[PDB]
Amino acid sequence: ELLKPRTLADLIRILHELFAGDEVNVEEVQAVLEAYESNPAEWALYAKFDQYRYTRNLVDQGNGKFNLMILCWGEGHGSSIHDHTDSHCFLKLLQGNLKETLFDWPDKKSNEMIKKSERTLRENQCAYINDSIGLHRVENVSHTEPAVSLHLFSPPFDTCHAFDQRTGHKNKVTMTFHSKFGIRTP
Numbered sequence: 027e028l029l030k031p032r033t034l035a036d037l038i039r040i041l042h043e044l045f046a047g048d049e050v051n052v053e054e055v056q057a058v059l060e061a062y063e064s065n066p067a068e069w070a071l072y073a074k075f076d077q078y079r080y081t082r083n084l085v086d087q088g089n090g091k092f093n094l095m096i097l098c099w100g101e102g103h104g105s106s107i108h109d110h111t112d113s114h115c116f117l118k119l120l121q122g123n124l125k126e127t128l129f130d131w132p133d134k135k136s137n138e139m140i141k142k143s144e145r146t147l148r149e150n151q152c153a154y155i156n157d158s159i160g161l162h163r164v165e166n167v168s169h170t171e172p173a174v175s176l177h178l179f180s181p182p183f184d185t186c187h188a189f190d191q192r193t194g195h196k197n198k199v200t201m202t203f204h205s206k207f208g209i210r211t212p
């Protein structure tokens with residue numbers, strides 16, 4: 027029985043219910059995330075930027091089965107092409123716009139990775155990826171506006187792979203946190 031989250035806090039409570047069992051209903055989770063209307067005051071605490079690259083800010087640790095974070099993207103900031111370590115990944119825009127470029131898993135052969143597609147994710151939209159769908163890059167292409175996104179990962183994971191667009195070669199990356207619960211974590 028899915029209800030609209032009134033606030034980020036409400037959203038988080040609802041996520042604990044949704045993940046109360048062993049199986050994830052992806053469409054339900056995506057629906058509730060989308061239904062949350064971004065309110066900058068509610069997440070300002072987590073929206074910590076860095077001048078040179080995008081940041082990952084932990085919001086909620088979940089119930090063992092997921093966690094929830096906020097990512098902050100300066101003008102021109104973006105990610106590698108990457109996977110998500112056999113986890114569900116939900117991405118919702120809270121401010122600005124992000125360009126998401128989808129790539130297929132590379133064949134064993136060293137080849138240029140060619141874009142399957144791209145789309146512009148706009149404020150409040152929720153996108154979903156998992157490894158069975160493919161790989162992606164996410165970028166703030168704006169010259170004038172920062173972007174902020176809300177991400178849900180299930181199960182949680184702290185490692186992933188980055189892919190070189192020229193070759194498809196991957197490298198294992200350990201992902202870090204800029205902050206946890208509003209507290210900067212050097």
Ligand SMILES: [Fe+3]
Pocket residue numbers: 108109110115162164
């Ligand atoms: Fe990603």
